[PDB]
Design an enzyme around this catalytic site. Structure first.
Site, PDB file in Angstrom:
ATOM      1  N   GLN A   2       0.820  -0.924   0.028  1.00 37.09           N
ATOM      2  CA  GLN A   2      -0.065  -0.052   0.172  1.00 37.09           C
ATOM      3  C   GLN A   2       1.106   1.314  -0.117  1.00 37.09           C
ATOM      4  OE1 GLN A   2      -2.113   1.852   3.563  1.00 37.09           O
ATOM      5  NE2 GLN A   2      -3.335   2.720   1.907  1.00 37.09           N
ATOM      6  N   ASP A  41      -9.528  -1.190  -4.108  1.00 35.99           N
ATOM      7  CA  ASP A  41      -9.512   0.075  -3.467  1.00 35.99           C
ATOM      8  C   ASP A  41     -10.675   1.094  -3.177  1.00 35.99           C
ATOM      9  OD1 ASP A  41      -7.117  -0.738  -2.031  1.00 35.99           O
ATOM     10  OD2 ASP A  41      -5.839   0.194  -3.876  1.00 35.99           O
ATOM     11  N   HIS A  64     -11.267   7.908 -16.195  1.00 38.53           N
ATOM     12  CA  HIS A  64     -10.906   9.140 -15.695  1.00 38.53           C
ATOM     13  C   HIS A  64     -11.688   9.259 -14.294  1.00 38.53           C
ATOM     14  CE1 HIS A  64     -10.927  13.774 -15.770  1.00 38.53           C
ATOM     15  NE2 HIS A  64      -9.605  13.498 -16.155  1.00 38.53           N
ATOM     16  N   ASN A  77      -6.087  -0.233   3.909  1.00 37.35           N
ATOM     17  CA  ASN A  77      -5.793  -1.508   4.397  1.00 37.35           C
ATOM     18  C   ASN A  77      -4.472  -1.893   3.687  1.00 37.35           C
ATOM     19  OD1 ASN A  77      -8.863  -1.687   2.518  1.00 37.35           O
ATOM     20  ND2 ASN A  77      -6.721  -1.559   1.188  1.00 37.35           N
ATOM     21  N   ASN A 155      -7.135  22.858 -18.395  1.00 36.07           N
ATOM     22  CA  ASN A 155      -5.685  22.749 -18.773  1.00 36.07           C
ATOM     23  C   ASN A 155      -5.579  23.314 -20.207  1.00 36.07           C
ATOM     24  OD1 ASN A 155      -5.636  20.360 -16.914  1.00 36.07           O
ATOM     25  ND2 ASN A 155      -6.858  19.049 -18.407  1.00 36.07           N
ATOM     26  N   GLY A 169     -15.816  26.525 -13.997  1.00 32.07           N
ATOM     27  CA  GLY A 169     -14.866  26.830 -12.916  1.00 32.07           C
ATOM     28  C   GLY A 169     -14.893  28.437 -12.750  1.00 32.07           C
ATOM     29  N   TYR A 171     -17.138  30.791 -12.968  1.00 35.80           N
ATOM     30  CA  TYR A 171     -18.109  31.269 -12.348  1.00 35.80           C
ATOM     31  C   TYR A 171     -17.859  31.169 -10.894  1.00 35.80           C
ATOM     32  CZ  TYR A 171     -21.116  29.565 -16.743  1.00 35.80           C
ATOM     33  OH  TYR A 171     -21.349  29.227 -17.742  1.00 35.80           O
ATOM     34  N   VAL A 174     -17.896  28.754  -7.250  1.00 31.48           N
ATOM     35  CA  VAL A 174     -16.847  27.679  -7.364  1.00 31.48           C
ATOM     36  C   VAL A 174     -15.587  27.785  -6.949  1.00 31.48           C
ATOM     37  CG1 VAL A 174     -15.798  26.006  -8.970  1.00 31.48           C
ATOM     38  CG2 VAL A 174     -18.227  26.741  -9.618  1.00 31.48           C
ATOM     39  N   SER A 221      -7.362  18.361 -13.527  1.00 32.52           N
ATOM     40  CA  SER A 221      -8.486  17.610 -12.991  1.00 32.52           C
ATOM     41  C   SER A 221      -7.994  16.160 -12.097  1.00 32.52           C
ATOM     42  CB  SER A 221      -9.181  16.813 -14.157  1.00 32.52           C
ATOM     43  OG  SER A 221      -8.697  15.952 -14.972  1.00 32.52           O
TER      44      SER A 221
END
EC number: 3.4.21.62
Length: 275
Positions: A2, A41, A64, A77, A155, A169, A171, A174, A221
């Site tokens: 992990q 996971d 994605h 875990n 991007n 974004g 506006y 946000v 993102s």
């Protein structure tokens, strides 16, 4: 076994994590294209699709969905990595089409469904160069009710000085996330704007990938997901806090990185914003 992902320590969720808060009773809606529920996971709590032709909301072709849903919250875990709201109740909301299906009308009814089951934290790691009247209509609504709406700023890069943060974004209700690396340089592909709120871990951010797998992505993102979870857990400690109490504790505690228009407030500190 992990592994702790470089961006997770670098902001400091794990300060909040070993404090006991992981956002157990928090919900983040992951507004993307999917989320494999047989991923070892991930624990997904539920969701829906707003894509007409794609029954399962738990079918992600585009990869994605799952990728993002992993800086937010992979395992707890001895396998894969380590999410940053590792305890949230995570809502798989689908509004992307495989290939990249962009229907704004998919996007809005997605916030919707999100409004309707009391989401606390909203994450959209998408956006575009054009807006729309409605988009920013709803966008207002979720924060109105009390949701904290978190997106990728986008991007693009420069193109002189005007602005390449995209919609939703740009506006102002946000929280738009710009990507930095572990050396807090802003990534060449991170959008620039007035409308850029904070900076976050966007380069070589490794997360969860379908078929018993994990992998890494560069994205305004992938940062956007660090940002959403600091917030969960912000909320997990101060679960009584307002949707605004929260933006505030976020804007005013980061790490200052460099001029406001490449960097915004700088880097978000979970431990400073948490308390």
């Amino acid at each position: 076994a992990q592994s702790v992902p470089y961006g997770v320590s670098q902001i400091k969720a794990p300060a909040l994590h070993s404090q006991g808060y992981t956002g157990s009773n928090v919900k983040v809606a992951v507004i993307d294209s999917g989320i494999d529920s047989s991923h070892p996971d991930l624990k997904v709590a539920g969701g829906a699709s707003m894509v007409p032709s794609e029954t399962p909301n738990f079918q992600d072709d585009n990869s994605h969905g799952t990728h993002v849903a992993g800086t937010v919250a992979a395992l707890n875990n001895s396998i894969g990595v380590l999410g940053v709201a590792p305890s949230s109740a995570l809502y798989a909301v689908k509004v992307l089409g495989d290939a990249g299906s962009g229907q704004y009308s998919w996007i809005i009814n997605g916030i919707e469904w999100a409004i309707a089951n009391n989401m606390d934290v909203i994450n959209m790691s998408l956006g575009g160069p054009s807006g729309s009247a409605a988009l920013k209509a709803a966008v207002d609504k979720a924060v109105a009710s009390g949701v904290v709406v978190v997106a990728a700023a986008g991007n693009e890069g420069s193109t002189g000085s005007s602005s390449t943060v995209g919609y939703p974004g740009k506006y102002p209700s946000v929280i738009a996330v710009g990507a930095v690396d572990s050396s807090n340089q802003r990534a060449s592909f991170s959008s620039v704007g007035p409308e850029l709120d904070v900076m976050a871990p966007g380069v070589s951010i490794q997360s969860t990938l379908p078929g018993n797998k994990y992998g890494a992505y560069n994205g305004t993102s992938m940062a956007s997901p660090h940002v959403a979870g600091a917030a969960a857990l912000i909320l997990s400690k101060h679960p009584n806090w307002t949707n605004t109490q929260v933006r505030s504790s976020l804007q005013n505690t980061t790490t200052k990185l460099g001029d406001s228009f490449y960097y915004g407030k700088g880097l978000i500190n979970v431990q400073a914003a948490a308390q």
